[PDB]
Amino acid sequence: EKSKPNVVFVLGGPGSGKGTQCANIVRDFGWVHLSAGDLLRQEQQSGSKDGEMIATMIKNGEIVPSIVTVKLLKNAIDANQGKNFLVDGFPRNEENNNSWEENMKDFVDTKFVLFFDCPEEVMTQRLLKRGESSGRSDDNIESIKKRFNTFNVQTKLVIDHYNKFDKVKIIPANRDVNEVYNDVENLFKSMGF
Ligand SMILES: Nc1ncnc2c1ncn2[C@@H]1O[C@H](COP(=O)(O)OP(=O)(O)OP(=O)(O)OP(=O)(O)OP(=O)(O)OC[C@H]2O[C@@H](n3ccc(=O)[nH]c3=O)[C@H](O)[C@@H]2O)[C@@H](O)[C@H]1O
């Protein structure tokens, strides 16, 4: 009857430019952008009894259990029948990914991982610049470095799992936004979107 939603995972390190590029894709393609980090922050800022577990894990650079995050994602997905979805910053974890694959296979068809490859030194500067005009409080050195380790230890393994099935599109993000987005747009255009 109706087609299953296409989902594209957008992965990459802290400040690689995931949210910046997903905003350009929403604009030009009309996909729904779901930042899993933001959805979790919104679950914390409302009550929940998962908040505070969410507060502290987020602050140490840890990955919240999928039983929270996959629910938040599935709810937004359910509410937006008719859309395709950019899920940003997920999956961070082998456990998050297995949960995705066992709870969401029947619902959506997950197309590829879009990986913004970026040097740590540039992501660090991008983030320290952002907090220097008081964007976030996550935007200090202790937090950035913790997230670097979680990315390096846990989420680089998800990426080359998906690369075993030729399911990772890599876009080097160490350029100007417009240089990076031209590649993004052209990819989405060639994928038939
Ligand atoms: N090409 C470019 N050149 C120069 N500047 C560029 C640029 N692109 C962007 N900027 C500039 O870079 C800064 C960061 O950008 P942004 O687009 O915001 O980057 P992004 O990759 O989205 O980085 P973000 O700051 O969101 O970091 P994280 O990916 O670390 O954070 P997230 O919000 O995804 O998650 C935070 C925490 O949530 C938790 N989490 C998140 C998801 C989940 O499934 N589970 C979960 O537990 C984890 O603890 C995680 O550490 C901005 O000032 C921007 O203007």
Ligand SMILES: [Mg+2]
């Ligand atoms: Mg983001």
